[PDB]
Amino acid sequence: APTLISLLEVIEPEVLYSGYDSTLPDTSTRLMSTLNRLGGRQVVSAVKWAKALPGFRNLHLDDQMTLLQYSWMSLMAFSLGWRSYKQSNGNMLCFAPDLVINEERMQLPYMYDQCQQMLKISSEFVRLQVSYDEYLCMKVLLLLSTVPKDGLKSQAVFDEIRMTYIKELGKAIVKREGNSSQNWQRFYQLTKLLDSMHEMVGGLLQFCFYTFVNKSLSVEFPEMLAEIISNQLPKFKAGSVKPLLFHQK
């Protein structure tokens, strides 16, 4: 009998290549535009993943769009943290197999601070020694952890899906452990990490919003990312969105 976790493993997309061009000397604008082109393709991959995620299709189409538009940066930064953890133990930002940022390219304008923020996310995977299955369940919960303050169209369906994957995270914890000496402590630590992701990616999202709206900086965005940000941005800046937290603020 197939398990939900076994299905999360098989639907996880393969990692994308950048195609970045060595030949041009690096500039902050060129690098950020290259990263946004990669991000747009990773978001397309994430939409295909969400369509395959058991239960997601049960949601009203408008809620499917809301959840992807609200959570895309959390999904992308979490997966970047995982790749950087597995490929470098959190020492380098492993955007793609052909695009690694190490401390010496972080020195371009605007790159250092955002790169430190991305590395902190990877540093949490190292600190907690997160297992693949724990990561996969947590990543689903990120898709389900930012919602409109005034609710979703299919709220009861959403509540069912979210509780289902909360229990799946518990199952992933029990599989990681040899027995149960610290299953609650582990669940506490991982839900504290999920809660912290809202703040840990907030600076990335605000910088994304600035580079999107400030045409002066000449940072390019691909079409589907631009459409998503143009919808997400007014809702976030107006304070009409809320995180679903496990623990008291």
């Binding site: 397309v44 939409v47 295909k48 369509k51 189409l61 499917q64 769009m65 992807l68 538009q69 079409e223 589907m224 459409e227 998503i228």
Partner: peptide, 10 residues
């Protein structure tokens, strides 16, 4: 909408 198109596509 590109996102909507993708969600509806096979």
């Amino acid at each position: 909408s590109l996102l909507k198109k993708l969600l509806l596509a096979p």
